[PDB]
Symmetry: C2
Subunit: 341 residues, 2 copies
Amino acid sequence: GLDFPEYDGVDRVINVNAKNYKNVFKKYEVLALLYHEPPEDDKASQRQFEMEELILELAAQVLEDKGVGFGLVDSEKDAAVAKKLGLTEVDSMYVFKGDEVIEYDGEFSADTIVEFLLDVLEDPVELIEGERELQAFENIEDEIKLIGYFKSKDSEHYKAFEDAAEEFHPYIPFFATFDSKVAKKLTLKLNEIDFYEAFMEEPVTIPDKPNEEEEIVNFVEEHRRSTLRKLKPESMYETWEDDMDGIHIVAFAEEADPDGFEFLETLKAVAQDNTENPDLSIIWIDPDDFPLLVPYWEKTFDIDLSAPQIGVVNVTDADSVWMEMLPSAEELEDWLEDVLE
Amino acid sequence: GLDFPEYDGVDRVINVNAKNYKNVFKKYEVLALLYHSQRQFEMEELILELAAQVLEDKGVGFGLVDAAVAKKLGLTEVDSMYVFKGDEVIEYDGEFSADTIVEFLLDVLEDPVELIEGERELQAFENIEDEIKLIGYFKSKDSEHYKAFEDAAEEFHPYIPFFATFDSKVAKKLTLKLNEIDFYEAFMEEPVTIPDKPNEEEEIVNFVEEHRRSTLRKLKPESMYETWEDDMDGIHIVAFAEEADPDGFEFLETLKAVAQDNTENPDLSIIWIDPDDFPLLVPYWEKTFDIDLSAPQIGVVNVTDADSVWMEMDDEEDLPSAEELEDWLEDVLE
């Protein structure tokens, strides 16, 4: 009962053009489109393009029963209809669910793609009712999370909260509660929203505005970057473009390794003592989550990823300087504050 | 500085013959051989071709196996990957994907014994409960007791992590005497001491193989087939719970509570599956078992009949207690 799926050979990826795109959008509730460029006149890039379809074809086969369809849009022959749908970022995949146009910013792998669309398929807002369920919510700390207290799911405030949830779906989990006892523990007023920074226990309340739907969106985009961020294969490329003057403070730590877990607890403590400084934000990369990238990382950065590492990586030219080594919570902090320019 | 590897097109997988193996075993420190529908065959080499490109400079070579050396090398299973490192043959029992194959081989390259020095590292060691672990207190690698421990480590490498310490401060916290070895059951906090018996080495192996089944086990992609093939009755108690989801986190804590109070029953061994770790298998599980994996699930799977009996929880407030789950699993006899 562990049948790992193998490719059928059946063609399910659609060639979306200006003549059939209207009918394809009616076919599927959730539609994934690989917005691509035609391969250049060199079989070096052609070989690379067919594997992109091979990954999509497997994902189309695995998610066929979920009402998910996969398509291809060429930007030099179907550039017209590409603009009507909102396909702008080139060589990117876009997911369409109702009125949502979500750009995929993660691994172009069969596993991550299917996992990402499974997360697009779930509802943008999850409800918390029991205190036993609230305790579980508070122990999720590796990501940004928003929770609000509303009178009803038919309320105008919940629908404004749900609309903002679909804006960041499915990267940022949005939680809601109608239980007055749950809001008591969170110190949450009616229609008040709690924003939890990553790896933080104390949240912050989003200020109330007349257009609250837009307020949640701009507040999230203002606080999307935390002092400590975990690189995840689903949003890996989205986290990499959030550079700080062209550099990235990258720390490698294996969570399953006690030496890496020991350094991970240090990065957690450093995140607390430096919540005040936004210029200091560490991207924690667990190399156990990115096996295909550690030989490139070891070669480019000249480090051994079997041990905890931390340093500053240049986004442009991939240059890097790394701390020499386990460091204490304080020792790490000024090691960061003495490399500024 | 985040360039995902893209396939070269260069063939690095060697077609091994009965006049090839003696030197390709010498060219590479670690050798991974795929003991092999018409179309389905050559595309699973594409997964192998990406792994060979990624592990090009790690001393890892990939090969394809003709039946003459399958006799000598020990390749037995129908379509499986065998990994060679020194005097050991490791049979791969995980996802056949570029994700887990590269990750599995990086662990094979690791040393079989990891050392714990200092109390800060000891605390972090105790926060790892996803797998069975062993910790032994010796003096040095020169010790005769350490040699038996390290020898037992390579027979389970890299499935069972083996830990050691020469620091007396670390062993005092664990109350581990010299040459004493503690066996941590998965998701169990307090371990049991392996008895120090005349011949140490295989008593560690006999103890580990005897206790290879914990009350609660986590299905991991690199060892997915190792478990579910450590099978009794041909049946498996399968629990689905997303750790990143609060609703699944709550049911996970109920599963953890069961793993403490019920080591008495030999046949209460739940396999916790996190569907977030196996996206390619979610639609298959939802169709074979007829359950929605967005919510916690637990039930008995009978591979003999491909049958399944599930708990049928309406909503979150329908999730069972630590004792309701224990009772429900017991009354499923035949």
